[model samples]
Target chain A: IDYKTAFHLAPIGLVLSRDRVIEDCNDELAAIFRCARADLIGRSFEVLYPSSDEFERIGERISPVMIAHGSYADDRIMKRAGGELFWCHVTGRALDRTAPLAAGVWTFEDLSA
Target chain B: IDYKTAFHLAPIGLVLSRDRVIEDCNDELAAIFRCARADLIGRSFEVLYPSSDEFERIGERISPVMIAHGSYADDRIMKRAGGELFWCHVTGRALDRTAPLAAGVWTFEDLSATRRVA
Candidate 1:
């Protein structure tokens, strides 16, 4: 399969983002979040967080780590479409370390199970 | 970043295989398995398993699941390059359901801290 197909069909959830806004997301990500792909696209990532405050806090918290290492990973509580909370292992790498949130690729694994 | 860069820089381990042979793998995969990226490329996945028997057994066990669902996932014991055994959560999707092992993409999560070897 090609890279595009592989990204869409990846076993784990994936997302492409710019400034914390979802540019695109994969099928598995839609499945994990229990939302339609269209719903996630163009949406603010805060929609997937348990609370806006947590989302804001996490963005601030991960910036330094991403700047220093070019990547960051952590386990956090995430909200599904129906407002169900679950533990998720989230990881991401910045395309440009100096502008950590400008553009990035992210992976999300549901740890709820 | 492009898909190629994303795949290579992905925080989790990723592998591309054809008939159970490693066709390509990402940097995180090499790091997680504690080996050089070159050592893993073109190598049999058996090298990352605890034993030949386990490798054979898992292949057998996952076939039906992959055939039925086009994917399979499980938590199992995996060995690092130095033979340090640890628990890993493995997930994969077959490119062709009829030939479950023909080609696939796989992800591995180190679960050593949260899970113990059986």
Candidate 2:
């Protein structure tokens, strides 16, 4: 499927992760976060959120729902590297049904645009 | 959400399985199959289809896709317990990523109402 190319070329911001740590990410995600690919990788997803409260709640609130539903999608405000906030449609899927965070794929579609 | 109530009250047919065995199913699935819930339980999902070939390919064709995408959905023909064939939109999700079959949930929406047969 030329997955590497597809992963990079996907229209929406895509992040492949293990828990909240970014394992691999695409340029669109970097652009969305207003950061370089180097800056985004190997960092906790918390860096993309404007507040710790949202960062904490993002994982805690959606894990159970994803476990039960296998997929979760919602819209919320996201912070860019320079602190610009924008509404985004966040969709997450569990690569492991046993736990939502063991490994997964997530997408961020900028709704404010 | 109250899972038990959600499981039963779901308007769409739902089935929970481990390796294609019917571990649990909603009444809506039984109704779609034209069979009793008791009859559908504990049976391999094969009985709900018309052919052993299709039953066999369902796993082989979907496992890789589900492994890659984490989900699969399509429209196809399905057989009732009494052998009446109908079109259904089948959707599946992995409950365990290590293996596509370790655990999963599947939904069958009767699309026969709008789907035309050639």
Candidate 3:
């Protein structure tokens, strides 16, 4: 499918990865997390989740999907600079090896006010 | 704190809610979700979540913080139009009743780079 439209039309956030390496994102994902496109590309999922309890929970939730169903679904909050949070939903799916380094796509949205 | 600086200098996404009504956002937030500043203001968190399983997890994790701890922490993915996704780290905290909404701030970093590496 078309790429620009994906970026423009995506209702939630989108990120791609290959072997767990990050690729690209849409505007909504960038907004949900308060990041710019420039800041997202080429990062690692582990870095995004880090080694925290929250990260552990996320990994636990998505790991099985990656191995069995080839997809993961979940959500959480975006922690900002001054100590605040926004709720967001997460969806993860694996991609073909032929796809770019961002072989896996992850999508999210904010739910908390 | 100053409002413009909050938008311009804030390190993460910020949204305010007064009586549970959304207020506004910073450019970082505008960029994170592919939305123009115009699209985000006055939107509801529930609309954003849409009653998905992921949203349920987020609510379970964040609800208590809002009531007692006053904050929530987590991460997830956003599905672009073409069925792709990106991993983002999220952190959110409550705002003072007097503070303007786009009040609460949510910060995230993309693990999947679309820039130098992606």
Candidate 4:
């Protein structure tokens, strides 16, 4: 499946992080944030996790995750376009920078699922 | 694509929901649970959201999310196959009963992206 079509067809929230920028997201992902996919892609991840405490919590978990495991996954509540928290299961890994990769591809799903 | 392969190739977590039973999951999802797909397919979500409080919070979140939005999204910590918690972003929606759906399809992701944001 093509990335874009596979993206929307995948039935999960997909986020593209590359060069430290969010390049795109799938429709399911936009639904997670309660926003249009257009509003999410090309934006910075800072919008997703915006607090210093939130940052530290994530850093504490990520480094060990990527190196030792090559991947990690879980769920948490996040602020949306309207600023309310909803739970999601997020999974991710480090993208090979040398490759023509489209940033880190992380997908999301609502907790209720 | 078939839900089984789409289940794995999704690049996110995928859990099938139907008849109040879990039928299958994808590779990315199996990774979150830290187990081989063979080992996880039929387990109840009761295993995922084991705690009563967890259920309460989710139920509370559901009413508004389903009635008003038809969907919901967010990330949070979850216990793996080893029973350890890790952050993830999950998205889901209600499935119709008739069409031979595998089950509820939900995907999970890690919060590492949130870290890079800062």
Name the top lDDT candidate. Answer: 1
Query: What lDDT would each prediction earn against the true structure?
Result: 0.86, 0.71, 0.51, 0.58
Runs of candidate 4 with Cα error greater than 4 angstroms are A1-3, A50-52, A97-102, B1-118
Model 3, B13-90: lDDT tens digits are: 545444334565555566666667687677655444424666566656666655564545566765432335667666
Error of 2 at B102 (Å): 2.6
| Tens digit per residue, CA lDDT, model 2, B8-43 | 544456677778887777777888888888897788
DockQ of each: 0.45, 0.03, 0.03, 0.12
Supply candidate 3's per-residue lDDT for A105. Answer: 56
Looking at candidate 2 chain B, the ten consecutive residues that score lowest on lDDT are B109-118
Q: Rank the candidates by DockQ, best first.
A: 1, 4, 2, 3
Which portions of model 3 miss their true places by more than 4 Å? A46-51, A81-83, A96-102, B1-118
Give the least accurate 10-residue stretch of model 4 chain B, judged by summed lDDT: B96-105
Model 4 agreement with the true structure over B12-116: per-residue lDDT tens digits:
566665543456666777777778887776776656653657745765665466446555566566667767767766665555322222334455655545433
List where candidate 1 sits over 4 angstroms from the true fold.
B112-118
Alpha-carbon shift of residue A73 in model 1 (angstroms): 2.0
The backbone clash count of each candidate, in order, is: 0, 1, 62, 38
Among these predictions, the greatest TM-score belongs to 1
Q: What value does DockQ give for candidate 1?
A: 0.45
Q: What share of the true interface contacts does each candidate keep?
A: 0.54, 0.00, 0.00, 0.13
Model 3 lDDT, residue A61, Cα? 55
The TM-score of candidate 1 is 0.88
